[PDB]
């Protein structure tokens, strides 16, 4: 059962948490092909590993800049947690290493592209389609939270679609191991829970709020709280007034009312039955939770793939040459990486 599985998962996690993998490849073993996304501290590139011929996604982070912008702890969290977790809907870290200038995280290449792209392109997902992805997130948060992990950055741009049409969660940049409350103002404006914005101190219930936002956006085509600037979004979030599209089922609106609950003693995922309040909700009544975990459910959408290195499902980004300094930068800050 659930319990069994989760206890053995914790034992494997804690072992890697306490003795993380380090230095398992080097830069010249990969041929860099194209940028898959740029980000605050570098970029993610499609690469080909020369000795196996396999394609991977290499996340590159500039060390000096991470120190300058005071994101060291978050970066070390990201790698320390990603190397230790293992779950069917979490992207797999295959290699990690650092050089004079950069940190590198080499993950499995998820070739279906961001959920974001598919969602904007098609407009919105049907409820069965949104439910198929939402179930994977419910199971993944159950797993992460059991490990005392909070994820803190759910959004369609951090969810990739694999060749089988299942989700791969990526970007553990704000993931943190904490038993109770934490205080950092971080995440993505549309997805922030009211208690984050209100600087109250907060816990893993922020991930269940974010699920509420994700399910809304998947099914509506737009987020429940939107405006042109973050502060205008924050205002609507804290009001917590939510309006639902015409086409939302009654079950869907009732689930969302319980996830997008400003009040912590009332938010689903955070009550006495914990995740089970969500799994047992009527909107998920057709959902076969074990079949999902086992990936035996037919995906509603399968990405069109044209060969292992195909990037057709990603936008184009401006390329920039990867520079590596002949002087080591920030060695001590990133010793454990």
């Amino acid at each position: 059962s659930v319990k069994e599985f989760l206890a053995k998962a914790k034992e494997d996690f804690l072992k890697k948490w306490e003795t993380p993998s380090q230095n398992t490849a080097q830069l010249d073993q990969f041929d860099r092909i194209k940028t898959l996304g740029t980000g605050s501290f570098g970029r993610v590139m499609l690469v080909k590993h020369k000795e196996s011929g396999n394609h991977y996604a290499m996340k590159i982070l500039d060390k000096q800049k991470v120190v300058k912008l005071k994101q060291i702890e978050h970066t070390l969290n990201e790698k320390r947690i990603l190397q230790a977790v293992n779950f069917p809907f979490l992207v797999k870290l295959e290699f990690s290493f650092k050089d004079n200038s950069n940190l590198y995280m080499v993950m499995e290449y998820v070739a279906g592209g961001e959920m974001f792209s598919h969602l904007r392109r098609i407009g919105r997902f049907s409820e069965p389609h949104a439910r198929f992805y939402a179930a994977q997130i419910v199971l993944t948060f159950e797993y992460l939270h059991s490990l005392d992990l909070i994820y803190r950055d759910l959004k369609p741009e951090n969810l990739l679609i694999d060749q089988q049409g299942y989700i791969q969660v990526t970007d553990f940049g704000f993931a943190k191991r904490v038993k109770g409350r934490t205080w950092t103002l971080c995440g993505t404006p549309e997805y922030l829970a009211p208690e984050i914005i209100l600087s109250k101190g907060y816990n893993k219930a922020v991930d269940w709020w974010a699920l509420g936002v994700l399910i809304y956006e998947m099914a509506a085509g737009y987020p429940p709280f939107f405006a042109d600037q973050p502060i205008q979004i924050y205002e609507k979030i804290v009001s917590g007034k939510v309006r639902f599209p015409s086409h939302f089922s009654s079950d869907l609106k009732d689930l969302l009312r319980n996830l997008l609950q400003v009040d912590l003693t009332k938010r689903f995922g955070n009550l006495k039955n914990g995740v089970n309040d969500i799994k047992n909700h009527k909107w998920f009544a057709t959902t076969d939770w074990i079949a999902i975990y086992q990936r035996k459910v037919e995906a509603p959408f399968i990405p069109k793939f044209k060969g292992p290195g195909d990037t057709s499902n990603f936008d184009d980004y401006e390329e920039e040459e990867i520079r590596v300094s002949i002087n080591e930068k920030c060695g001590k800050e990133f010793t454990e990486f």
């Binding site: 959004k155 085509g221 737009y222 939107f226 599209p245």
Partner: peptide, 20 residues
């Protein structure tokens, strides 16, 4: 419509994170 107002807004593209 709400959809038209969203699509005419400034935040329909990939959204960056915030950390302060």
């Amino acid at each position: 419509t709400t959809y038209a107002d969203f699509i005419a807004s400034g935040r329909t593209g990939r959204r960056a994170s915030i950390h302060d």
